Design a binder for this molecule. Structure first.
Ligand code: GNP
Ligand code: CL
Ligand code: MG
Length: 177
């Protein structure tokens, strides 16, 4: 049967984990309804179809004992932060990287910056400037990726779908080659 790949997506509340999965799998960004489900996608990689199982997770502290129950048999993790939330970025090193590695010392991690569409949005830049902050830049995201031993750093927008297929393609190749 098809090569199966278990991919688990983690990161702070509101970084866009669920939208990333729905936009990727259905080719449509959620409207009013945003639903921690498992999505099943099929991907053609080097001429063979692959069964990508995608596991959504809750980012909140209340699930700190329950969430890791989904981790066994994971083939690759995506650690997500919003490019327009520096707090979510800091939490990659402070929370997500240590949690994943505590349970899965060897599983490849891809770092994904989300909400790419908002990085040069004026209202967003101004909002962040008021708190003495700025959107996370590509060099900064890449530096965090190296620091956490990630195999790849990617940026995407679930809303426009820019970079979205590449995230999951690279996820698969980190497992398969
Ligand atoms: N502009 C923009 N907004 C986005 C994008 N992806 C998600 N959002 C918005 O960000 C918010 C959170 O998205 P969501 O997918 O629910 O995040 P989450 O990471 O699943 N949160 P949780 O841990 O609570 O379940 C929603 O308002 C959603 O519309 C994106 O690419 N661009
Ligand atoms: Cl890297
Ligand atoms: Mg969600």
């Amino acid at each position: 049967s098809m090569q199966a790949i278990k991919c688990v997506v983690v990161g702070d509340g509101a970084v866009g984990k669920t939208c990333l999965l729905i936009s990727y799998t259905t080719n449509a960004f959620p409207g009013e309804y945003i639903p921690f489900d498992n999505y099943s996608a099929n991907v053609m990689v080097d001429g063979k179809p692959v069964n990508l199982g995608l596991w959504d997770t809750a980012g909140q502290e209340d699930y700190d004992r329950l969430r890791p129950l989904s981790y066994p048999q994971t083939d690759v993790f995506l650690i997500c932060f919003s490019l327009v939330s520096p707090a979510s970025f800091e939490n990659v090193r402070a929370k997500w990287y240590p949690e994943v590695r505590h349970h899965c010392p060897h599983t490849p991690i891809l770092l994904v910056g989300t909400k790419l569409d908002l990085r040069d949005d004026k209202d967003t830049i101004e909002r962040l400037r008021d708190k003495k902050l700025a959107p996370i830049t590509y060099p900064q995201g890449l530096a965090m990726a190296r620091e956490i031993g990630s195999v790849k750093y990617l940026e995407c927008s679930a809303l426009t779908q820019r970079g979205l297929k590449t995230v999951f393609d690279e996820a698969i190749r980190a497992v398969l080659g």
